[PDB]
Amino acid sequence: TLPAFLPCELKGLVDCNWLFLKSVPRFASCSNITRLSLISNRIHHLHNSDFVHLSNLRQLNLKWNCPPTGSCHMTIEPRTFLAMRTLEELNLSYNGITTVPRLPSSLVNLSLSHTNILVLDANSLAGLYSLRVLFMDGNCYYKNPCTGAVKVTPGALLGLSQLTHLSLKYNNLTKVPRQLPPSLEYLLVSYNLIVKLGPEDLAQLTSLRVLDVGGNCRRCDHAPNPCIECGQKSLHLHPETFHHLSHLEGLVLKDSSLHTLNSSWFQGLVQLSVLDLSENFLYESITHTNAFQNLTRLRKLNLSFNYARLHLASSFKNLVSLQELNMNGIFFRLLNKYTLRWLADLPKLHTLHLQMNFINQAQLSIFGTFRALRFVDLSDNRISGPSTMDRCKNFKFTMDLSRNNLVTIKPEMFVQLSRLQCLSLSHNSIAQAVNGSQFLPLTNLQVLDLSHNKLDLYHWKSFSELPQLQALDLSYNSGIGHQFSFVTHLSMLQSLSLAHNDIHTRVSSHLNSNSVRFLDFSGNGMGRMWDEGGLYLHFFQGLSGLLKLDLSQNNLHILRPQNLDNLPKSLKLLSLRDNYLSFFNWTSLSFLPNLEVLDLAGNQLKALTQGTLPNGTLLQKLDVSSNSIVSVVPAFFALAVELKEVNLSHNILKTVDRSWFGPIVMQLTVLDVRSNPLHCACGAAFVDLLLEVQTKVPGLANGVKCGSPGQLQGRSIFAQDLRLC
DNA sequence: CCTGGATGGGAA
Ligand SMILES: *[C@@H]1O[C@H](CO)[C@@H](O)[C@H](O)[C@H]1NC(C)=O
Ligand SMILES: *[C@@H]1O[C@H](CO)[C@@H](O)[C@H](O)[C@H]1NC(C)=O
Incomplete structure (x- = not known):
């Protein structure tokens, strides 16, 4: 078996x-x-x-x-x-x-x-004539130190006639290894000490598609970890170094202390798809250079962390294949109509990274003038106003304005951004009574993230200017009107989060909607609310068609049948994870006829005795992990016809018995029983049960441990054979 | 190259 x-x-x-x-x-x-x-x-x-x-x-x-x-x-x-x-x-x-x-x-x-x-010679790799890939990074650097450097002898790898990939990073190398196999397509020699490059170092490397010579002359300004500062002021690049690389698709020159560019470098790289120029000193250069003139097949350009108004060079208009541009950590405080002018007619530019730039003034309207922008990241700047669930991935015009300095949202800030489908305003300091006037131009906005702000949510006209809004994230939000009264007035809203909110005395006793399908209401005080008697007894009932409800971390100590019965009858998913449910009548699940998924982990169900799973529950998955379950009444799971997944892990079961299940046990797709102090006597009967469903119990082979006897404690139920008695 | 902003993965 x-x-x-x-x-x-x-x-x-x-x-x-x-x-x-x-x-x-x-x-x-x-x-x-x-x-x-x-x-x-x-x-x-x-x-x-x-x-x-x-x-x-x-x-x-x-x-x-x-x-x-x-x-x-x-x-x-x-x-x-x-x-x-x-x-x-x-x-x-x-x-x-x-x-x-x-x-x-x-x-x-x-x-x-x-x-x-520390040495690679011809004898090191003797007979490896079919070797395609060889990696040897990190043999002489600050985390794996050595005296001197790794030595790769001239022609040592020549016997590797089929070698396409070679990586020799972090090895204190001073020069590119000589006479490398001409078959190379990938060569990574970054983060050594190769302070000088010429065409000779790349001699016969005519099958190269990617070359990474970065980090060989490092500015070590504000270096979090030990860093070898370059003796030179810059990497020394011979102007003809790369010309013969006719299949070069990727080149990375990151962290090389480059103070200017020389168009010579890229002159013959007629398939340069990816260029990494990050962590250099090309601030002025990107503003004036002509180097980009012929970089015509370039799809990705990274100018991030390159240390008068910033304005990209005119040559940028030639990058007609450009799909992605990184301008993080450049640090310019102004975004105007000239800053990125030469990008606007580029036919395939879909992604723009503009974070960590201390931008305090932005004419965002420019992003409405572009040809195919789909994502612009403006997060972690200092924007405070107009100038003078996010996924959304790949398919939606998306803008990230998180971690800025917005305290007040004024609708003029969104002029010409009317094609925005997804927007994040999270982790700002917006303290505002939202009243339906803030987001007028955003006629197409589907996803809005406003988490970690200080919104006043009393006004029932809130977000009513957003007629396509389908997903609204108000999590971690901190005497007229009623909280959350606006929900019924947003006809498209399918997904909503009010998690970890400040739920005050005048909070609406009802949430209403015909469209909300997922509501995250975790980390609130539903325990205190439902303790107020009838006042909040129907709090969720008005959410017609609700399919998913998260009531995690709400300090629930009981769940009366009335409160269940008055949840929307459409519920398929309910999470009571990390509450204090000590007792619970499982037959009361009858009050949730369409329930398929139930999560009761992180509670204190000391046992599964009180009632059973009722006819004819449609329950598919039951998570009851991290409860101190010490016992289960027989036939408990027997009636759940549709049961497929059950998690009993991290309970205090001494056994797991067949009697708990019956015939259902053999349609189970998962049966998790890990981290139970199982009692592993030489007689133990659970072993024969688990082996029967081995294919469907996770980590059976060694993850299912014994809690007793004392010698077998902490060890697998196979540390000794238990079937010998 | 990918990843992040430092570094470790990687794999015709
Ligand atoms: C681009 O290529 C043309 C010839 O095809 C050449 O005249 C021009 O100088 C090149 N631009 C740069 C800056 O390399
Ligand atoms: C079962 O529950 C535990 C609780 O921590 C969790 O770690 C584990 O991933 C779950 N297993 C399955 C099969 O989902």
């Missing part, structure tokens, strides 16, 4: 991740397994016979078994990996090895990143 691969899990992948193993597991027949993952175990020594039973392995991951500081040194016998003559992928990263082990020629992908291998 047992799973064949104790103490690991069978997914042709055998998963043995995070099992504290100090040796390679031996386990039926192991002849059919092809993938083995042993990530973050404790294997510090490998041996000639350790993989002999796994001769058919294609993929082997040994990452994080013997990590150097922060020490650990891994020893590897000469023949360990040779047993696997068809090994294709191997990850040896985060292991304390000093030389590369002998490897079979079948190998295609190899990772030696974050090890202690």
